[PDB]
Design a protein around this nucleic acid. Structure first.
Lengths: 12, 112, 343, 88, 318, 312
DNA sequence: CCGTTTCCAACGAAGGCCTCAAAGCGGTCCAAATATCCACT
DNA sequence: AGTGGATATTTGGACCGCTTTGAGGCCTTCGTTGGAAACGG
């Protein structure tokens, strides 16, 4: 989803 | 390559029955003790059956001799007969051979 | 009757394990099995049959089997090469377990009811419900579980509870879900990070269940109102913000101090990804509110209802303006702002 | 569990009796006599009763002598009375 | 008899399995050639049964069981609460020539003439220590082996440690026996009780400090109040010293002082209070109270005078 | 609807309104319908506290069948191997008894006890107590098919409590939760129990504090005569018949200053753990011991309101 | 006024329950004798 | 009943998680003991 993608972009 | 003599193979059944009836953990050193007691009991049983058959006047062993022996042992009485013990402690395949039963037009087996 | 022979005991037990039904379990057969167990001991082919008899009649037999281990021997028969031949010829826990209703129903009874004496409808068992046509044929009469939580992971029961609107069921589910969410949380009432992915999976299951039924539960709303001031914004961001989208329609002035104040306080001091996530969540919330309001006009009036969504739009516009001023005019946020205004 | 200690059997073995062993024993002990058709079954029943008596006596002797595991002296003292009671 | 066998069996059952061989070797009652015959790999019950059989085949008296009990107690020595005594001597008395046999004889004869049935067992070990096990009784009862009394005496010193088990009934008699057998005049009990015998030994002998003087990082963080921190650190280091603190576990204070704070100003009666400090390692948690911010820089003198005054129980009045 | 009222009373619990004051517990003669032997049995024992959700379809008419089924379940759980019949008589027994005179108002449900008895009467091995005192805030938001008994007390081993709770949860669809008492409620209980009037003092007043020194460990006990504590409380008490937060603060500050004047230790930086007085004794883990039979209803109502706040 | 029987306060150990770690092997899968048996003659 | 042929039995081989024993902690609750107090001479 979009929220999981934002999360994985935040982790990096 | 296992090797088992028929004597131990025969006594293992009664040893396991003893272990099941004990309902308690038992040390291994008691197995040979139970086997020796079983051997002594079998010797005394054979001697008692021999003397009872000799006193009866016949060479063969009949169920009345074993009934008399069990009565002297305190297990069988007039009220609690052998049939009660057979029904309590023996399966159906042996009860069909020991206790007489009638069926199919008063056909009784065994003949008693 | 052939269970008396010790040679045919396991095979006859395996056959009865397949031929057993509900009308066959009777007390005298239970006593027969009990005396057989007392005479022979702990036999797996007897333990399986006793467990089946307990499942079919829990008010007569109590058995707790320890472990699944192999009860019936899986010895391939002499016709395995024939079994394959006939096959090739014929080619061409957090959530409670699913169990029947408690046996306390009709516990104290003096005589038989007038219904079953006349052989009326009655009810439909729960173990027989295994397919969709069986649910279609018996949708009006069903047996409810002993614990409502087990409904959370069953589609055939979700289809039933989609249109029920019953008070006791809703109360039971509310209490169970509220207690579970309160005890399993990571930052509320306890410092227990040992749960971790378990809470995330539970929230994912709840979200997947509430996407169906096109509505949300009250326990989730209460948990949101309780645990929001203590949230940090990074533990379960995705699941939390997806749960925020399923909020029932209410007046903006009443729901503002409980949710939106804390949301803005966490929004104005976080990173840009948090801003994009809350913008997506607000867009989804507006979509859900509009979808639920569009159906009421076909059936507070509409004048007082449009004011709430107008105030929500003005509030999110103020948020977007302040965020654009703060983030130094980043296009990554303007994209989400325009995506919201598109809807 | 140590190899010296054996836990009680949770499940009992099949109730089939070793008739051949009893026949061979009765033949090797007293070969001059002949047993009847089903005398071995009565001998097996008597042996079952004897083993039950010995088991209960050893159990009570072990539980009364400050022991949770049946030892050699317990079954010894039990046999010293059971063997004398079993003859007649 | 059977009582001796039961006593030995209970004493052996009290002993753990990993250190049973050391206790059996220190006992030295059974011969060395009889130990390897027993297998210590099997269950504890069978080993204890074989040991009881071996001890019954040989003549087992009551002194051997008492010696085994003394050995076990001096090996553990942490299962009882210990108290200290102090004996005084007259001014005109000279230094005595201590003799162990005369001491044993006098200590035995005093209790033998006071009571009638009493068991006394001695064990003289190095560090100049005598362990005494006493089983009490009277003219109409037999000595009770279940409630013994343990005494540790140091020769030519005014101190003696005792285990508080049952001497509350025969305390004056034990004091008389100790002050007569050791050629003293008076005896008094110190306000110092503890379960750790070595800590009491180090405190009473005041040998816990054995240090003598002889010639033979993230600059962006600004720590304010650093002068107060260094001052409290210096005060703590000066008050509690730098030596390893003796291990205690309990302290008790009784207070009969007046309340001084409008509030109970007219009251003329004291406020009765009883305070207890409990910790797995006392004198080490207190030392860390001032740097942690829970107490002031100088602690009250009532808490920093435990090893210096050799006191554990305190009473304070107005 | 009751669901709307439940949601309203739920979302109303905010931290804006000022908490109210409490009345001084007044001794009251208990009703004469209660069994004195049961009251004497309930005193002087330590109980473990639990909060419980309403029970679904619980009937007071059939209590023998419940006991029989629970006995069969416990016996089958003890021996994990063999089967167990329901109507069989075992070595242990389960008894469902009904308590009387334990309710606060006429609208509260009746209390009852579940006891495990080893026959050899036999010896009691475990006791469970379900009660609800002054629970009108909960009885309004619940339908008629449920029974509200939010307070649960257990006395015995935890191994039996686990089985009883599992059976109750599987049968009536409820939820058991441990109940804890923080230092705030303990400090309130201390003052509320000191303000009470007693004829004879049987035990001194004691407080237990745990000093946070995580590398090390240390506990402090503070015992004081009941008469001195009563005088110290009367010195600061000025509101007739009521207890206020400022009065509790002053009562605690008196002891804090008295301790600091002697030991120079700030007792305000520690954590209160246990509070014992002449009427009752309470621990922070959720353990209560009741001594006086006159102030039973007050303690029961306090614990019931705590459980109601926890479950809502 | 003083000695004796009795209820009350209190330390204790005593037992009962809970938890963890380590040594053991029973149970499950699997080989190829081999022995139980049923009637073979 | 000696002879016979066949097919289920099992015991030694091998390996992992279930199993129990030993040890430590810690608690809640009865009992033995010392002592203040009412009663008898």
């Amino acid at each position: 989803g979009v929220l999981a993608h934002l999360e994985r972009l935040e982790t990096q | 390559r296992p090797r088992q003599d028929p004597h131990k193979a025969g006594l293992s059944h009664y040893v396991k029955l003893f272990s099941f009836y004990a309902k308690m953990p038992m040390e291994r050193k008691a197995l040979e003790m139970v086997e020796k007691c079983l051997d002594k009991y079998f010797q005394h049983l054979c001697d008692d059956l021999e003397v009872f058959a000799a006193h009866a006047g016949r060479k063969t062993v009949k169920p009345e001799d074993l009934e008399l022996l069990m009565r002297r042992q305190g297990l069988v009485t007039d009220q609690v007969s052998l049939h009660v013990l057979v029904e309590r402690h023996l399966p159906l395949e042996y009860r069909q051979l020991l206790i007489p039963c009638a069926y199919s037009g008063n056909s009784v087996f065994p003949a008693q | 009757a052939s269970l008396q022979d010790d040679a045919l005991c396991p095979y006859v037990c395996h056959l009865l394990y397949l031929l057993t039904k509900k009308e066959n379990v009777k007390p005298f057969r239970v006593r027969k099995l009990l005396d057989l167990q007392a005479k022979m001991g702990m036999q797996p082919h007897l333990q399986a049959l006793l467990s089946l008899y307990k499942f079919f009649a829990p008010a007569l037999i109590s058995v707790s089997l320890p472990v699944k281990k192999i009860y019936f021997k899986n010895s391939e028969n002499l016709w395995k090469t024939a079994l394959l031949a006939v096959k090739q010829r014929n080619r061409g826990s957090v959530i409670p377990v699913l169990n029947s209703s408690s046996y306390t129903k009709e516990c104290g009874k003096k005589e038989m009811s007038l219904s079953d004496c006349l052989n009326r409808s009655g009810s439909f068992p729960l173990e027989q419900l295994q397919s969709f046509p069986q649910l279609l044929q018996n949708i009006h009469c069903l047996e409810l579980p002993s614990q409502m939580g087990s409904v959370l992971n069953n589609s055939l029961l979700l289809h039933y509870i989609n249109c029920v609107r019953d008070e006791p069921v809703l109360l039971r589910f509310y209490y169970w879900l509220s207690q579970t969410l309160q005890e399993e949380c990571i930052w509320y009432k306890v410092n227990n990070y040992e749960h971790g992915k378990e809470f995330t999976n539970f929230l994912d299951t709840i979200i997947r269940a509430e996407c169906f039924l096109q509505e949300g539960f009250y326990s989730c709303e209460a948990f949101l109102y309780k645990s929001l001031p203590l949230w940090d914004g990074l533990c379960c961001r995705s699941q939390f913000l997806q749960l925020v989208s399923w909020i029932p329609f209410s007046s903006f002035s009443e729901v503002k101090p409980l949710l939106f104040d804390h949301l803005a306080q966490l929004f104005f001091t976080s990173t840009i990804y948090f801003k994009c996530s809350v913008l997506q969540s607000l867009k989804e919330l507006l979509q859900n509110w509009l979808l639920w309001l569009s159906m009421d006009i076909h059936m507070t009036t509409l004048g007082g209802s449009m004011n709430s969504v107008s105030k929500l739009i003005h509030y999110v516009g103020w948020l977007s303006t302040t965020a654009m001023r703060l983030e130094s005019n980043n296009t990554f946020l303007l994209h989400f702002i325009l995506d919201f205004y598109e809807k | 569990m140590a190899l010296s200690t054996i836990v009680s059997q949770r499940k009992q073995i099949k109730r089939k009796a070793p008739r051949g062993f009893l026949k061979r024993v009765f033949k090797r002990k007293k070969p001059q006599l002949r047993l009847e058709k089903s005398g071995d079954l009565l001998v097996h029943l008597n042996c079952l009763l004897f083993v039950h008596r010995l088991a209960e006596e050893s159990r009570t002797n072990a539980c009364a002598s400050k022991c949770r595991v049946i030892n050699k002296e317990h079954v010894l003292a039990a046999a010293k009375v059971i063997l004398k009671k079993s003859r007649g | 008899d059977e009582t001796v066998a039961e006593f030995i069996k209970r004493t052996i059952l009290k002993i753990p399995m990993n250190e049973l061989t050391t206790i059996l070797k220190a006992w030295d009652f059974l011969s060395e050639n009889q130990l390897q015959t027993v297998n210590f790999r099997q269950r504890k019950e069978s080993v204890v049964q074989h040991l009881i059989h071996l001890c019954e085949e040989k003549r087992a008296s009551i002194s051997d069981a008492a010696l085994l009990d003394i050995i076990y107690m001096q090996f553990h020595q942490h299962q009882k609460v210990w108290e200290v005594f102090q004996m005084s001597k007259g001014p005109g008395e000279d230094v005595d020539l201590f003799d162990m046999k005369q001491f044993k004889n006098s200590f035995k004869k005093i209790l033998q003439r006071a009571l009638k049935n009493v068991t006394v067992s001695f064990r003289e070990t190095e560090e100049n220590a005598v362990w005494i096990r006493i089983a009490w009784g009277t003219q109409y009862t037999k000595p009770n082996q279940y409630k013994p009394t343990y005494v540790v005496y140091y020769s030519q010193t005014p101190y003696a440690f005792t285990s508080s088990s049952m001497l509350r009934r025969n305390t004056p008699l034990l004091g008389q026996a100790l002050t007569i057998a050791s050629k003293h005049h008076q005896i008094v009990k110190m306000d110092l009780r503890s379960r750790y015998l070595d800590s009491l030994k180090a405190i009473v002998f005041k040998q816990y400090n054995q240090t003598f003087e002889t010639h033979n990082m993230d600059s962006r963080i600004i720590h304010e109040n650093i002068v107060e921190k260094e001052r409290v650190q210096r005060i703590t280091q000066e008050t509690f010293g730098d030596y390893p603190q003796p291990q205690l576990e309990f302290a008790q204070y009784k207070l009969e002082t007046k309340f001084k704070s409008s509030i109970l100003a007219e009251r003329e009666e004291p406020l009765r209070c009883l305070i207890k400090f409990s910790s797995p390692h006392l004198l080490e948690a207190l030392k860390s109270l001032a740097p942690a911010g829970i107490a002031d820089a100088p602690l009250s003198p009532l808490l920093t005078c435990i090893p210096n005054k050799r006191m554990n129980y305190f009473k304070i009045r107005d | 609807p009751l669901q709307k009222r439940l949601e309203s009373v739920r979302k109303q619990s905010s931290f804006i309104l000022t908490p109210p004051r409490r009345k001084i517990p007044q001794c009251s003669q208990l009703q004469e319908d209660v069994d004195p032997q049961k009251v004497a049995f309930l005193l002087h024992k330590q109980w473990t506290l639990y909060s419980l959700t309403p029970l679904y379809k619980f009937s007071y008419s059939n209590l023998k069948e419940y006991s029989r089924l629970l006995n069969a379940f416990i016996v089958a759980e003890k021996q994990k191997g063999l089967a167990v019949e329901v109507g069989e008589d075992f070595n242990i027994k389960v008894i469902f008894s009904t308590l009387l005179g334990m309710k606060g108002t006429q609208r509260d449900p009746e209390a009852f006890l579940v006891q495990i008895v080893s026959k050899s009467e036999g010896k009691v091995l475990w006791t469970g107590w379900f009660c609800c005192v002054f629970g009108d805030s909960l009885l309004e938001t619940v339908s008629e098919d449920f029974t509200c008994l939010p307070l649960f007390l257990a006395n015995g081993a935890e191994s039996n409590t686990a089985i009883i709770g599992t059976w109750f949860q599987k049968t009536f669809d409820c939820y058991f939760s441990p109940l804890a008492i923080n230092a705030f409620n303990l400090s309130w209980m201390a003052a509320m129990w000191t303000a009470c009037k007693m004829d004879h003092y049987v035990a001194t007043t004691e407080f237990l504090w745990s000093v946070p020194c995580s590398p090390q460990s240390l506990d402090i006990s503070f015992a004081i005569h009941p008469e001195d504590a009563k005088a110290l409380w009367d010195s600061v008490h000025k509101t007739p018949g009521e207890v206020t937060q400022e009065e509790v603060d002053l009562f605690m500050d008196c002891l804090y200053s008295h301790f600091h004047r002697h030991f120079k230790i700030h007792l305000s930086a520690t954590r209160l753990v246990r509070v014992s007085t002449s009427v009752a004794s309470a621990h922070t883990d959720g353990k209560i011991k009741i001594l006086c039979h006159k102030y039973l209803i007050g303690v029961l109502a306090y614990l019931t309101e705590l459980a109601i706040f926890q479950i809502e």
